[PDB]
């Protein structure tokens, strides 16, 4: 499985949970920047470590970030 | 007294080149797919 | 302040300025440390010292008709046996090594302890000229100015003997014959393209 | 030249300078290996190998213990042979 | 879950063939393992090396029991000059009779390999005569071998395991392998000279049997004890002497005659002699530096911690490196593996133009083909000395103990640094390639006398410094009235002056407009290569690019298509691309030596200075024409001895084409193709019926990297290795 | 090789000069694709004296930006 | 306070005085294992054992008209032939030193094939043991004397004495070793 951290640079503007084809992500109320919502990653066993919500963050440095790791059946992307 | 035989190459390369590596190409297939308890 | 090396310039800040020889020469700003001036202070001093003992030495063996400064340790490859005023020495090289070797080492040694003492008096001073501590200033000054003058001269002697050969008093004594005729700029070897 | 003169000679000259000359400015620099501090805290076997474990005291008065003399006394034997082994080439035939 | 492997249960989890790739790829990463502990790590490294030591001592076994059992060395010491030494015997059932007849050669009783390694020169010169001699090398070896893996295993057991504080003992070390490792060994060798090797290049046997009723000189030690040294070096073997004779010699055991012996054309066995007892008297004295248990010697921390320059130049200096470098493994192998391929390098540069084997010059294949060994080796490992540079910086360095002294403010100026290698390397090439370029248009107008060649005046004037009079610099050992002339003029200067100025032999090889350009293409390579490897070191933790790259490890595949691209951004790949062009600069290297030593070997030295200005030169004389024997080795008509490098020749170029493949195509293009390989497989009949158990998947990003570049890397030395050896055995041998 | 580093000089002592200047406009983007004709030869020329006016700037030091003003990477 | 190998030299800690002999030696510190500390002892005894039998050997030997020299002995040609002599010697010493080790694992100390301690006489104190130690470190010093003399002066131990007791300043280590060439020429 992947490791996929949220740093607290998020704004709250929810491109990386749309970009995720593997639906890992989602957004969860926040007080910490102005949209009050902040990414999160509850389903990281499913990652398969694309990287395309690292693509859409708009911060700089990023706030969403995705280390592989331990490869499996679906974090490896196998239908067989 | 250490001179080999005139006749080692003719067994120990077979044994060497045919023999042992299919033995441990078989021990190590074996060992790889072995599954934990 | 004893002068000024370049007239109209400012003095660096690092170098006191009752400091024995101050002119404020240090383009490269080699004492900025004050540990390392310091350090320099003691040495220049000392390095002074022996060069005025050294060029005195130098010149007194020439003058007296003993050879130069440079022929000097012949004797000793030659296989010819020591001589000082002309009364032969009985040593050799290798045991001359013995008795400088232990009695430098002693007499270094036992300054090195002193942690940078470079005015010790006392014994040093058996006469008391230096005794005021008031008065020291121009005697300081006067020890200083000749110390550098002779590292100065020393560095002409093996400098001008590694060009023309010949020793110190042999070279001035062929500069007065024709000064415009025999000098550096005309070695051969100080400047490559006269 | 005489072996016993050079080799005895140099090496009571290296002990002598060693012992009234440089023992202080040698003990002063073994303490700065103090300010570090000691190389292993530990109670193994191999921790132990590590450590002062003979302390080797001296009866001399400036502590001038055996180790000291060793150190000095190698030195003037080492000088000495570079003496004698030098002079040696002097008169030497086809060498 | 699978066993394999048992060190990561990462690994073991695994349902692809990843987990035996990379298994097998990570076995030796000791600190990525699960459970491993600091303590626990040493003692594996500890371990480990034993059975290095064990490998190499019994690989040494293997070649004296083999040119014993199967070689010609007891001819071959009759007559060296005019006889090929045989490796080992050759048992292919694959051979048709013309093969078995074209390898039986030297008088053998069947098909035989030339040896190229050189042993028989080198075991020759030690003393070896018969082939018993060699048997009982070979038995005192596999018996070593034994010794060492026994202690491994040892050292393993519950009470013999070292604490982590054994191995971080610097001082007692240091004072150990200096007096012990070094200086022991270089005065045991002396010993084996003085007493066994020069009185067998004397005529006289000296073995286990009678080596104590037997004096090495005439007067036994009294010249030792007395200081009278210079006894052992009376009477030195003439010139008439003849190697393993008494016609000729001498009684002398130390010398410092400084040149060649006129017969073997190396080094006099009595200068090998003095050379080793000179070194190991000043290796057992710097062995005693450090502080133990005594009292006395130096602690290396605080030399480190005074040398801080005092106007703060270089900020704090060296302090806290102690820890730095006592505390990395990877800092200990950087400096290990610069030191240790420098020195191979110097191997190959000193062995070439001082051969101290005899009969070893004439052996025109044996000395190409150690040159080109060591110094594709020494490549090698300093390629490795950057890689665990880079390794330390992700892994093992930490600001805060490093604040402000030499190794943080590297660092610091890092984009200065790399930008004056830039420069350097563009410098290096725009006008390299500019020269030859130009000189080739000259040649193709048909106007030579246009070209630009430059005097390596520099370069002449250093031979002209050592002696080398063709110059008419007249500048010290070239002048005679020079003190430095005159002082050494009754050790070492006749024999040193005779040997530089003899011109068949490589001691300073005649250089001109041919080697000015070559050296300068050599120092593009070195600055180029060192630029990739520093790049790769100095950007090791993190760039613009990828502020946290230390967060990732030293070697990941990328970090996506995202910020442009990330293709190839970690430090492993900064090795990986650097290899390419250590291995192009070791090429330009070893070309120029076998060029330059083949026209020499010839006779006709003006080929290379004339055709070596321009790059035509080198492919149409050096290239192609040097071809010819190598792939007539088989041919339609019939084949000969060659015919083995003939098919290693293409062997080397199919490993290397298809090391393109692993590095030109990549991964997506194959797992797609593999997922219908997946398919077929389960809908075809009668074939269904098997099955995996570890899922099919293409090689991963960084893996096909290595594979590629090891295919890379094999076929460019099977290449050459065929080439070097069969051009220059063929035109000689 | 004193030839060619006057022309040398020259070249990149030309660049810099018409680079700065056009810094200062709205748009410094486009004056690149799109070349300043007018200005360019207004520099070509005075680009004679680089040498003299280079050695200039580097003693009241304005040729070299301060290592506060430079982007770097983390260290 | 007993007395120390070095004057006015405390004995280091890890040596206590309970062993026999214990002189406080020990510069390098090799003994500090209590488990090591005890196998060296049992070690310096069974080197000195062999030690004190094998210079007896020597003198009794060269006293008894024996020849060859005793480092020449094994050219000597007896009634076994030497092919013969090494298997015996290794299957009896290797049946004697492996119960020898048992021993010593199950009790700690020095006996002979099944009794440990071995001391059918009942002659057993401390005085004995250190008696033992001294007269057998006595011993390894005088074997490697005997080894080192006859490289050098290549005569037997009593020979060596007689020629220096003739001849003490003549004949001494200053003599030999600056005349290998006479005395190895012979
Ligand atoms: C206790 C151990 C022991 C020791 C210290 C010696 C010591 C010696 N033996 Mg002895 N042996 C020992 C046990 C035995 N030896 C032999 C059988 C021999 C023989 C057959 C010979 C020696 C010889 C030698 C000498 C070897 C000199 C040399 O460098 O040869 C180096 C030689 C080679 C490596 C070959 C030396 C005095 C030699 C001798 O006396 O020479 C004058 C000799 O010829 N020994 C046997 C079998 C019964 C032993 C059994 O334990
Ligand atoms: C205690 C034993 C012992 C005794 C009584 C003697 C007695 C004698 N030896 Mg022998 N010898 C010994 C030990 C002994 N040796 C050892 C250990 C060695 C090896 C270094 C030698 C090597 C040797 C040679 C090479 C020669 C003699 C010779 C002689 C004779 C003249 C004296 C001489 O030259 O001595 C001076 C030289 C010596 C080496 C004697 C040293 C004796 C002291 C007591 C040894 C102390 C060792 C010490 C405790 C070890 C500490 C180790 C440390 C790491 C802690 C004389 C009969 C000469 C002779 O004429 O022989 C026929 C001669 O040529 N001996
Ligand atoms: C690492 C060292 C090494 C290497 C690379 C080789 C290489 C070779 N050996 Mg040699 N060999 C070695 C050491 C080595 N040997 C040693 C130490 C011995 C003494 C036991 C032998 C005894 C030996 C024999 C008897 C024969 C070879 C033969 C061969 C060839 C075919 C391989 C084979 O049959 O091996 C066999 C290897 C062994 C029996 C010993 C292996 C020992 C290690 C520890 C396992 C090949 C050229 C054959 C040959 O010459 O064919 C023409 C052959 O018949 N070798
Ligand atoms: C060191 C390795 C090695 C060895 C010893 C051999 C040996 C042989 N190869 Mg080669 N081969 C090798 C590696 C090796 N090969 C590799 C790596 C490849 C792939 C690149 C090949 C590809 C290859 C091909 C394509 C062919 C050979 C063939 C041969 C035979 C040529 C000589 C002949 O006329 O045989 C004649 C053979 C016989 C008279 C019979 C010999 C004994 C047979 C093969 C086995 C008997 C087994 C026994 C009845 C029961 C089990 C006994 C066992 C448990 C002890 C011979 C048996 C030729 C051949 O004839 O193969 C059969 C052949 O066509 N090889
Ligand atoms: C004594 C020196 C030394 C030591 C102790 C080590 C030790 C280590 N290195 Mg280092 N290294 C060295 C030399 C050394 N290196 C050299 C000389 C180089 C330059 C080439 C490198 C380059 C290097 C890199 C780039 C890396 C390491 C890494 C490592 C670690 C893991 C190794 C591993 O798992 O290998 C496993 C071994 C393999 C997968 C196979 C190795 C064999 C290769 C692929 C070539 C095979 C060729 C083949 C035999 C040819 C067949 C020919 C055909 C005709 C038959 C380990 C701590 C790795 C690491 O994790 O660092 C932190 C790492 O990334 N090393
Ligand atoms: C023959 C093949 C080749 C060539 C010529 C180069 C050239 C270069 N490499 Mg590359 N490289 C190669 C193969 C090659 N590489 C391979 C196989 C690899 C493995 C992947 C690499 C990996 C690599 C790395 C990792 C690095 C380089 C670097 C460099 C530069 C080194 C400095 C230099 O020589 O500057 C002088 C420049 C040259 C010799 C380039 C050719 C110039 C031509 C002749 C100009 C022609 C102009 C003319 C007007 C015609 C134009 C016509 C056109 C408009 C139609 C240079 C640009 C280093 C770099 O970039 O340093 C700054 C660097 O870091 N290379
Ligand atoms: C087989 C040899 C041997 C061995 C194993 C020992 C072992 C021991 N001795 Mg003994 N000793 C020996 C020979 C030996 N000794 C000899 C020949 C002498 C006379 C010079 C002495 C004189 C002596 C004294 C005066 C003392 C000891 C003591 C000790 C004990 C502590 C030191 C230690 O751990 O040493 C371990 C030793 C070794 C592992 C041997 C290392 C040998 C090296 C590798 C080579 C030495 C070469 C030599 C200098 C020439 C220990 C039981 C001390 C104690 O308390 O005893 C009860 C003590 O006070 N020994
Ligand atoms: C370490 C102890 C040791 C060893 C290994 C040897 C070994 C040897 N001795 Mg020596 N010997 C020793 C102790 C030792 N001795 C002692 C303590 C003495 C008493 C003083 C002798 C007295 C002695 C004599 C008188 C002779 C030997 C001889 C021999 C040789 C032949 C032995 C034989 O045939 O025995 C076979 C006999 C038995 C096994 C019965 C033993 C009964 C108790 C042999 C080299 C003989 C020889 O040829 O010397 C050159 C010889 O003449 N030895
Ligand atoms: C008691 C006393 C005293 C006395 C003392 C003495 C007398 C001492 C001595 C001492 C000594 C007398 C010492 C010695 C030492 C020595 C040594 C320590 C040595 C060493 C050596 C070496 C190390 C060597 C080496 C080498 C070799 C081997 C070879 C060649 C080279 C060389 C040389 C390097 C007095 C009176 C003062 C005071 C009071 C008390
Ligand atoms: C990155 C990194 C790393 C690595 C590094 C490296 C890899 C390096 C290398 C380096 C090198 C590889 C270097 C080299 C050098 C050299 C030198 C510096 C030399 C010198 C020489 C000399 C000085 C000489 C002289 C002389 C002559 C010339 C002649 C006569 C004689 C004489 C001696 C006088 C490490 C690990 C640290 C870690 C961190 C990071
Ligand atoms: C031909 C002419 C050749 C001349 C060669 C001269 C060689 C000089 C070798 C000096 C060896 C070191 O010896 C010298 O070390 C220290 C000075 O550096 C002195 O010792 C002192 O030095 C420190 C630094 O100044 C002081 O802070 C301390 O009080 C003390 O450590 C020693 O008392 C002295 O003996």
Redesign the interface.
Known sequence: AHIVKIYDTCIGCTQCVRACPLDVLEMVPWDGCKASQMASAPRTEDCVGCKRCETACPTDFLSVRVYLGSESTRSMGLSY | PFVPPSWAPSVFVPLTGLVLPAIAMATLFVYIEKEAP | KAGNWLPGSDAPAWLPDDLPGNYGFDPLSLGKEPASLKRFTESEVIHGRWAMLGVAGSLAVELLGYGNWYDAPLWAVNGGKATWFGIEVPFDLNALLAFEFVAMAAAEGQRGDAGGVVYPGGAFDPLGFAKDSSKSGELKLKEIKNGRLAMVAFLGFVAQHAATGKGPIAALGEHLANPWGANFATNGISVPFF | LDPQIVISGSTAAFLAIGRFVFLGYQRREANFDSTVGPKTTGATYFDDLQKNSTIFATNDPAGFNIIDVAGWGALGHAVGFAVLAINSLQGANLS | ????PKFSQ?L?????T?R?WY?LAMAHDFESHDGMTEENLYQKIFASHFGQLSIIFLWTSGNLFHV??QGNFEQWVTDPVHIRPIAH?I?DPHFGQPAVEAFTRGGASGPVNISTSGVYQWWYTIGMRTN?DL?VG??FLALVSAIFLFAGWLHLQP?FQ??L??F??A??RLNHHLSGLFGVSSLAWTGHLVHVAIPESRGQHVGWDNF??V?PH??????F???????Y????DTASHVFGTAQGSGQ?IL?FLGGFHPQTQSLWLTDMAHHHLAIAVIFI?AGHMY?T????G??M??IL?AHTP??GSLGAGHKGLFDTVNNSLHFQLGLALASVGTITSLVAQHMYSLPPYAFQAIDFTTQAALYTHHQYIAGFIMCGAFAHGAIFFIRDYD?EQNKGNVLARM??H??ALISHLSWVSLFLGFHTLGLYVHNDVMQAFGTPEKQILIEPVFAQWIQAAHGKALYGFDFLLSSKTSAAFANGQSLWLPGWLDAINNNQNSLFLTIGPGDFLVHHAIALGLHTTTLILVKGAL?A????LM??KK??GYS??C????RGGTCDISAYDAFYLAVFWMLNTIGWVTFYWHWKHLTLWQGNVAQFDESSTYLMGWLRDYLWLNSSQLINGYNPFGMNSLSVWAWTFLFGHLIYATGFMFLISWRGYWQELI?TL??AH?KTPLANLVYW?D?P?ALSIVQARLVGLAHFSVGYIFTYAAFLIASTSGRFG | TFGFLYVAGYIGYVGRQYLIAVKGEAKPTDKEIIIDVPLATKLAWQGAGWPLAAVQELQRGTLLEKEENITVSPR | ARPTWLPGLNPPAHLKGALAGDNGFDPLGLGQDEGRLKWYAEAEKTNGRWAMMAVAGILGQELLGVTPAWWEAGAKEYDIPAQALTPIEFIVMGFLEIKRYQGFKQTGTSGFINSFPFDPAGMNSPSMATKEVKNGRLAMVAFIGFCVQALATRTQPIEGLTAHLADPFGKNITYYLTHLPETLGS
Do not use: C, M
């Open positions: 879950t699978k066993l394999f990462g073991a989890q695994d349902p692809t990843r035996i298994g014993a059992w015997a048992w018993q048997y070979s038995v009470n070292p604490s504080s054994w971080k003992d001082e007692s104590l009723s004096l005439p007067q036994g030690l009294t010249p004890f007395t200081g009278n040294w210079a006894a070096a009376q009477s030195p002398a010398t004295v502080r248990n005594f009292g006395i130096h602690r921390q605080a911690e005092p106007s600001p660092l610091d890092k984009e950007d933790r993190g760039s613009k502020p946290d967060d990732f990941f595949p970090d996506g298509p995202g997922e997946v398919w389960e158990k899922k998947v």
